[PDB]
């Protein structure tokens, strides 16, 4: 395999971390291949679930807990810390909140969160590599509590970073927020990508096309599929009660992605940097509720 950039995996990985049996587990947690039968049963369907008052409360709780865990991860970002150490802290933080770390064994993913550094677009596997001054790193968190999944991610600066890194991360965050500001009943899901690409392209960046936002509630990933690029064929119209994520992945160079031999790590084919931000949203009557928002601080960690 020919690596696209300077990053390399740092093995070996620690044995998979166990989750106490008292914590409720999603169906794929015990499947030998980590398959989710509930999700597969809906593969190919574009119908979007309309959440009940009970479902909404469940989503509000898990998303609040997920934010708490991402904040724990944020507090550990500093030169020298390895992504595996971040993952260990995340794992314990989920357990402390009586939640199962959704990524764990999802289709056999080996860790409890995704850590994506520099050229890694998404799904980076926490390993033995110490973060380096100048790196940008995204930590993607998803928790499962009482049958509901809550998902979010933020990109962080490791120590001091260059101007290119600041522009990329800032622009990516703006892309997500401009998309969120457009969410409300009546809007076509395919419209979000037009908004996102417009801002990214205006700043000389590209939009990853192989990964999209997704419905989320009792299932980790389900309808609707939400592309982040312009002129996509996303199916569906927003309606009060819909819950889904927007998680734009923006790149310094081209949008092309490829996967590492580990089967998960997605990287830019040109080896340039990528950044991402994600929130889980609930469509209301007026607009939308950002379920994974910070409640005690006005801005994301990179500008705090
Ligand atoms: Co997501
Ligand atoms: Co996520
Ligand atoms: K990255």
Curated annotation (Swiss-Prot):
Example GO BP: platelet aggregation
Which GO terms of the cellular component aspect does the record hold?
cytoplasm; cytosol; cytosolic ribosome
For the ligand (Zn(2+) 3), the binding residues are 140, 151, 278
UniProt cofactor note: Binds 2 divalent metal cations per subunit. Has a high-affinity and a low affinity metal-binding site. The true nature of the physiological cofactor is under debate. The enzyme is active with zinc, cobalt, manganese or divalent iron ions. Has high activity with zinc; zinc cofactor is transferred into the active site region by the ZNG1 zinc chaperone.
- Kindly indicate whether the keyword RNA-binding belongs to this entry: no
Catalytic activity, reaction form: Release of N-terminal amino acids, preferentially methionine, from peptides and arylamides
Swiss-Prot/TrEMBL keywords: Acetylation, Aminopeptidase, Cytoplasm, Hydrolase, Metal-binding, Protease, Zinc, Zinc-finger
Give me the residues that bind Zn(2+) 4, please: 151, 214, 247, 278
Q: Which domain of life is it from?
A: Eukaryota
This protein's cofactor list reads: Zn(2+); Co(2+); Mn(2+); Fe(2+)
Subcellular location(s) of the protein: Cytoplasm
Cystine crosslinks: none
* Gene Ontology MF annotations: aminopeptidase activity; initiator methionyl aminopeptidase activity; metalloaminopeptidase activity; metalloexopeptidase activity; zinc ion binding
Q: What is its EC number?
A: 3.4.11.18
Q: Which residues does a protein bind?
A: 123, 221
Role summary: Cotranslationally removes the N-terminal methionine from nascent proteins. The N-terminal methionine is often cleaved when the second residue in the primary sequence is small and uncharged (Met-Ala-, Cys, Gly, Pro, Ser, Thr, or Val). Required for normal progression through the cell cycle.
> Which family is it part of?
Belongs to the peptidase M24A family. Methionine aminopeptidase type 1 subfamily.
- Quote the subunit structure annotation: Associates with the 60S ribosomal subunit of the 80S translational complex.
Protein name in the entry: Methionine aminopeptidase 1
Species of provenance: Homo sapiens
